[PDB]
Design a protein around this ligand. Structure first.
Ligand SMILES: CCCCCCCCCCO[C@@H]1O[C@H](CO)[C@@H](O[C@H]2O[C@H](CO)[C@@H](O)[C@H](O)[C@H]2O)[C@H](O)[C@H]1O
Ligand SMILES: CCCCCCCCCCO[C@@H]1O[C@H](CO)[C@@H](O[C@H]2O[C@H](CO)[C@@H](O)[C@H](O)[C@H]2O)[C@H](O)[C@H]1O
Lengths: 467, 112
């Protein structure tokens, strides 16, 4: 069976620490996803519990992260905070399906460009989510968020193994309460937990038409969650030693999200930062995560009236630094295509404020580049008419085409009089196809050889630029 | 750009484009309300490029000896040639579409 209770003294303590670090995360992420803090705190609690009992890698905190929230933020403003519940249930179902089929090993196939793009987009979206707290601006907001960043970045060089964010929140709370500062408090953005999570059957979604609208977000949530769980797992593996079955971990994740959805909760996955803070502080048991969730619930129930008094500047500061911690990568001075994928995801997510779309275009772009690495999909065939005129029959789909490969398939050795270019069986899906053909024709014309284009409009009609 | 006017059933018309402002010069035609279409393009070297879909071997492009002039001879016009003919002077690139450095507002060409 191999089930233990080793090192309770350190596991409990670690769980306490990461719980104190867990409260503001869940509250904030709840606000970011346009929902009550209650949902996030509940999520963190129940997920931590179920993962503590059914998780694969002990000492790994699974609660509520932005990686999940920013994928539901669009579902909640279009259908509600409850289509969210359905989506979390279905998400968990997809995860236990993924674990039952034993498919974790395939997570390696996921392009690094897509992932790093997801991270960047995520972080800058966090930072952008902190902006609507500045549109209605009192200078107390600015002063307390600036002093927040200040105390978070300048205090820990003097202090010890206790969070500077803890001191930030406590101090700013005490100040805001005593001085009676005029600023938005957390209790305004949503209701905070006052009791235990009750069994809430998603009474709000309805069968099929619901399925057709929650399936995509459940898919993306599931995949992102399993990726996060995988990498977090492996990092805990490297930090210590284990033969953790990532399939069992995925299953536990699934069940957790399922019952979470059935108890009015958000969607959750593994948390890198808090898992690291945990293992660093001595947490390596399941009791660590259990005590994390439990002490989280107990403490949020204990400090509730004090909790709702916490100024939004503190939490917006904490989010402001968590964003910074998340974004910064290797901004390389490398494969152009992969960079294209990352920047595509980033820019699209930034412009649309939809992380799911960035993920989507990342997937399809990676798929296209893959098809370009693995197959042909287009070939030219030089044919001679009795006139002695070279006619190049371009057949197939042309997207992201390389100009070099296109030029190499044409003969420029002997400048003929006239050359026919047949596009009757071709399809241009990108402006690069155009550009390539242009380089060819420009080369021929510069060489003194005239070009006759055939069956053209059909090929240039498949252009994506036609929207 | 100059040469717009009215044409009959099998009539003809030459279109001289002047650049008042340099490898290659082009000509496109825009059907009213419909997607733009390529007509022809000619380089300094002497190489031509036609659109055998819109130009069924009827039209004839040539560059004048003058530095800022390109002529497009148009014969055997038909109801579907009725369009606005734009002259482009983009150089060293995009011989075929989407334009480059210079464009010129097009004139109307109507057949009957
Ligand atoms: C001829 C024989 C040759 C012997 C060669 C040397 C043998 C070393 C193999 C290490 O295998 C370990 O076995 C542990 C249990 O079987 C696993 O749980 C270990 O790791 C978990 C987390 O670190 C802890 O909770 C467990 O208590 C701890 O036993 C651990 O995953 C695994 O790596
Ligand atoms: C269908 C395809 C979908 C593709 C989606 C890809 C999702 C998997 C990416 C996981 O990568 C991890 O994500 C974390 C955040 O999600 C990062 O922690 C970040 O956030 C922590 C705290 O929030 C900080 O401590 C870290 O420094 C910071 O890197 C972490 O570094 C990164 O390795």
């Amino acid at each position: 069976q191999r089930e233990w209770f080793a090192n309770p003294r350190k596991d409990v303590l670690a769980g306490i620490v990461v719980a104190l670090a867990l409260i503001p995360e869940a509250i904030a992420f709840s606000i970011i996803a346009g929902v009550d803090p209650q949902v996030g705190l509940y999520a963190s609690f129940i997920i931590a519990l179920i993962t503590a009992f059914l998780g694969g890698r002990p000492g790994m905190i699974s609660a509520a992260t932005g990686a999940m929230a920013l994928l539901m933020t669009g579902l909640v403003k279009d259908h509600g905070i409850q289509y969210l519940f359905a989506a979390t249930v279905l998400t968990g179902v997809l995860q236990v399906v993924f674990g039952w089929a034993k498919l974790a090993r395939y997570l390696k196939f996921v392009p690094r460009s897509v992932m790093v793009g997801f991270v960047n987009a995520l972080a800058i979206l966090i930072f952008m989510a902190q902006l609507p707290q500045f549109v209605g601006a009192n200078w107390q907001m600015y002063a307390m968020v600036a002093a927040g960043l200040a105390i978070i970045y300048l205090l820990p060089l003097v202090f010890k193994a206790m969070p500077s964010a803890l001191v930030a929140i406590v101090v700013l709370t005490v100040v805001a309460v005593v001085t009676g500062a005029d600023v938005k408090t957390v209790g305004d953005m949503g209701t905070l937990p006052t009791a235990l999570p009750h069994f809430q059957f998603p009474q709000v979604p309805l069968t099929f038409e619901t399925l057709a609208i929650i399936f995509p977000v459940a898919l993306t949530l599931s995949l992102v969650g399993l990726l996060e769980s995988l990498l977090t797992a492996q990092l805990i593996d490297e930090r210590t030693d284990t033969t953790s079955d990532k399939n069992v971990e995925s299953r536990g994740q699934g069940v957790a999200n399922i019952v979470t959805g059935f108890f009015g909760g958000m969607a959750g996955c593994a948390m890198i930062g808090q898992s690291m803070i945990n293992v660093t502080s001595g947490g390596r048991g399941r009791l660590s995560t259990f005590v994390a969730g439990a002490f989280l619930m107990v403490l949020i129930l204990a400090l509730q009236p004090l909790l709702v008094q916490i100024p939004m500047a503190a939490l917006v500061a904490v989010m402001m630094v968590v964003a910074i911690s998340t974004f910064d990568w290797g901004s390389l001075r490398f494969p152009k295509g992969e960079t294209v994928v990352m920047l595509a995801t980033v820019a699209v997510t930034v412009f649309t404020h939809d992380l799911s779309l960035g993920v989507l275009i990342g997937v399809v772009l990676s798929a296209l580049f893959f098809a370009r690495k693995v197959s042909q999909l287009s070939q030219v065939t030089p044919v001679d008419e009795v006139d002695g005129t070279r006619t190049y029959r371009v057949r197939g789909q042309l997207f992201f085409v390389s100009t070099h490969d296109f030029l190499h398939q044409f003969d420029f050795t002997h400048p003929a009089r006239r050359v026919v270019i047949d596009l009757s069986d071709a399809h241009f899906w990108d402006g690069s196809a155009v550009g390539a053909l242009d380089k060819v024709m420009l080369k021929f014309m510069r060489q003194g050889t005239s070009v006759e284009l055939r069956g053209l409009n059909a090929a240039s009609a498949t252009l994506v630029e036609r929207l | 750009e100059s040469g717009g006017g009215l044409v009959q059933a099998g009539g003809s018309l030459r279109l001289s484009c002047a650049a008042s402002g340099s490898d290659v010069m082009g000509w496109f035609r825009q059907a009213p309300g419909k997607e733009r279409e390529f007509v022809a393009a000619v380089t300094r070297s002497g190489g031509k490029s036609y659109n055998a879909d819109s130009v069924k071997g009827r039209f004839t492009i040539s560059r004048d000896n003058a530095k800022n002039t390109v002529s497009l001879q148009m014969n055997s016009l038909k109801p579907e040639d009725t369009a606005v003919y734009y002259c482009a002077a983009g150089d060293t690139a995009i011989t075929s579409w989407y334009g480059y450095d210079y464009w010129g507002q097009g004139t109307q060409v109507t057949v009957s």
